[PDB]
Write a protein that binds this ligand. Structure first.
Ligand code: HEM
Length: 291
């Protein structure tokens, strides 16, 4: 099963920087969402969920086909809450109807990371919408109540190794769990709409207690009001993951560079780029443009 990137007809870097900027300006404007967290975190989770359905064995799933727009995937229990991200991006799609759905959802996550002061994430265009019957079945996104061996095995299906898994999980410094969406409640730190390495610092430095929440699920909670999923906490229970947690807690730049590479890879899994494809784009932030 081969998915070849096909650039939206006649488009180039400037076109996609315009779409970036529209997303970024709306991120700035719609600041009230989720008790003033803003839409940045949910856009990052949307880009990950539309990509995290990929299966390396048969190239099903993945960001290419934009299939989150179809009911079966939109209504996956694992995707509860991401409707808010889709609705955010709808007026953007209306203004730029030429962009593919996969390109929009993945660009929304790149834009959110960068606007939240995260690393630059190179991004490539050319995902092509595919029909409803190419939508992957529910059940391909991971469970949160599991341990390190589950996490490790899960991510082999996405061709991610230990370092890439630990780097990607640093996105859990962003946003929060919502009890009605996932049966978990609370944020993982204090700066949860700024992209930093706080997730690793908090795993190492907080005093975590294993508690039950109001949905009767266990999670790790700290007296500062932070929380970790069981799969988050597994990163300090496993000695291989713990080493990498310590590395990223002690080196902000290294985390940013490893995250950028793993996140681009996540967003590009499944896609074949022609040798003649444009090189990846690195968008300027609004701040860098004086906008
Ligand atoms: C073992 C792997 C993972 C599990 C089990 C997991 C699970 C969760 C759960 C249960 C939530 C809460 C959803 C809610 O209640 O609204 C969450 C939120 C989130 N996840 Fe993950 N996740 C994983 C990996 C990742 C990855 C790889 C990324 C991106 C790189 C990511 C980004 C996020 C973001 C940014 C949020 C906050 C969303 C919000 O505030 O609306 N997750 N995740």
């Amino acid at each position: 099963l081969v998915h070849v990137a096909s650039v939206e007809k006649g488009r180039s870097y400037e076109d996609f920087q315009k779409v970036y900027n529209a997303i970024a300006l709306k991120l700035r404007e719609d600041d009230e969402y989720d008790n003033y967290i803003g839409y940045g975190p949910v856009l990052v989770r949307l880009a990950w969920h539309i990509s995290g359905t990929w299966d390396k064995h048969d190239n099903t799933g993945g960001s290419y086909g934009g299939t989150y727009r179809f009911k079966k995937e939109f209504n996956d229990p694992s995707n509860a809450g991401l409707q808010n991200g889709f609705k955010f991006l709808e007026p953007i799609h209306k203004e730029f109807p030429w962009i593919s759905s996969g390109d929009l959802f993945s660009l929304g996550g790149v834009t959110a990371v960068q606007e939240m002061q995260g690393p630059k994430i190179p991004w490539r265009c050319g995902r092509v919408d595919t029909p409803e019957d190419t939508t992957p079945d529910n059940g391909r996104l991971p469970d949160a109540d599991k341990d390190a061996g589950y996490v490790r095995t899960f991510f082999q299906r996405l061709n991610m190794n230990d370092r890439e898994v630990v780097a990607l999980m640093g996105a859990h410094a962003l946003g929060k769990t919502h009890l009605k969406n996932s049966g978990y409640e609370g944020p993982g730190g204090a700066a949860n709409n700024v992209f930093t390495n706080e997730f690793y610092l908090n795993l190492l430095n907080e005093d975590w207690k294993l508690e039950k929440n109001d949905a009767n699920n266990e999670q790790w909670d700290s007296k500062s009001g932070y929380m970790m999923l069981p799969t988050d906490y597994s990163l300090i229970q496993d000695p291989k993951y713990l080493s990498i947690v310590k590395e990223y807690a002690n080196d902000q730049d290294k985390f940013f560079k490893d995250f950028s590479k793993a996140f681009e890879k996540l967003l590009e899994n499944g896609i074949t780029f022609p040798k003649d494809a444009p090189s990846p784009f690195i968008f300027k932030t609004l701040e860098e443009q004086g906008l």
